[PDB]
Structures are given as structure tokens and as C-alpha cells.
């Protein structure tokens with residue numbers, strides 16, 4: 587109860603099995619509300635659209651008692667590429683802000 | 694106590710102030726009329742109906758909320774686990790803040 591919010595990062599080299607392990611660990615929680623976002627379902631969108639989608643996904647979690655959410659392939663959410671480097675700052679700030687907001691009381 | 698209630702209520706329109714009273718009356722009334730399978734008053738034996746401050750507090754907490762907005766939520770959400778005293782720097786900072794408040798108060 588002291589810590590209504592908890593975070594965690596899974597890390598490893600490519601082709602390790604991160605996505606599947608995340609999905610399995612999420613499934614074995616038996617929580618009421620579970621959701622699995624991914625770049626695959628917003629491909630070709632603009633930044634504003636991605637921010638809107640992330641907003642809508644997180645908003646739902648605030649309307650339950652206890653919930654778990656998955657964010658896979660973060661490096662794709664924001665369009666990273668070695669040359670440059672070049673990326674989207676807006677989505678990065680959205681993520682950074684969202685990761686330190688606790689949900690409503692008793693959730 | 695009327696003065697205490699007036700102090701508690703701020704940014705309240707007259708309609709809100711009187712709706713608060715109506716809600717308090719409503720809860721006191723419900724106290725002595727209860728039935729689920731059927732409907733039945735308390736045998737008309739609640740002729741000593743008295744309204745306590747607790748009714749008003751419960752209403753003010755759950756029934757009537759000002760439209761202009763408040764600041765309780767931010768206070769409760771920001772100071773979560775309170776403030777403890779682990780070292781002098783806390784006292785020093787609090788004192789300095791009080792000094793600056795006095796400065797701006799009387800400059």
C-alpha cells in the first residue's frame with residue numbers, strides 16, 4: 587500500500603524471448619484489467635496520434651481497482667535510428683511523465 | 694455550528710450552500726425510513742428527528758462538490774507519506790521558507 591505504483595524493465599539482446607516472457611508473466615497475475623499495446627497497431631500514425639492512443643490506453647487503467655500494462659519494443663514507440671541520432675521528443679516526454687503519475691486513490 | 698460550516702465552505706454559490714442543507718435534511722430523514730422488500734416508515738416513532746453535524750460532514754464529503762474547483766486532491770496526492778524529521782536540513786529549509794513568507798508578507 588505504501589507504493590501503489592511499481593515499474594520494471596526487462597532487458598536483453600535481440601531474439602531472446604522478451605515479448606513472450608512478458609506476456610506469460612502478465613498472464614499469470616490473474617488481474618481484472620490487462621492490456622497489451624504495441625507499435626504494430628499504430629504503424630504509419632503521426633506523433634499526435636500516438637500520444638492520443640497512449641493517453642486512451644492509460645486512461646482505462648485508472649478506472650479499475652488493480653491493473654497491469656505492457657509496453658513492448660520501446661525503441662520502436664519512439665522512432666530511434668543510429669545515424670543522427672533522430673527520434674521523437676514528444677512521445678519520450680509523454681512516457682517519462684506518465685511513468686511517475688500514481689493512479690486515483692485506492693488503486 | 695454555523696460559523697464552522699461557513700468557514701469550511703468556500704467558493705460556494707448560494708445554490709450550493711442551500712443544496713448542502715437539503716442534502717443534510719435528506720440523510721437525517723433517511724435515517725428513520727428504511728425497508729427493502731417493502732417500504733415502511735419507522736412506525737412514525739422518529740418524532741425526535743435531530744440533525745447532527747455528522748450528517749453535514751458526510752454530505753460535504755460525498756454529496757455536494759463545488760464546480761469552481763478545489764485543491765484538496767493535489768495536497769493529498771503530493772504529500773503522500775507525510776513529512777518526517779531525519780536531520781537538521783529539514784528544519785533549516787522550513788525556517789528559511791517561513792522567513793521568505795514573512796518577507797513577501799511585509800515588504
Ligand SMILES: Nc1ncnc2c1ncn2[C@@H]1O[C@H](COP(=O)(O)OP(=O)(O)OP(=O)(O)O)[C@@H](O)[C@H]1O
Nearest residue numbers: 598599600601602603604605606607608609658659
Ligand atoms: N523459454 C522460452 N523463452 C523464450 N522464448 C521461448 C521459450 N520457449 C519458447 N519460446 C518461443 O520463443 C519465441 C519468442 O520470440 P519473441 O519474438 O517473443 O522474442 P523477443 O526477444 O521479444 O523478440 P523481438 O526481438 O522480435 O521483439 C516464441 O516463439 C516463444 O514461443
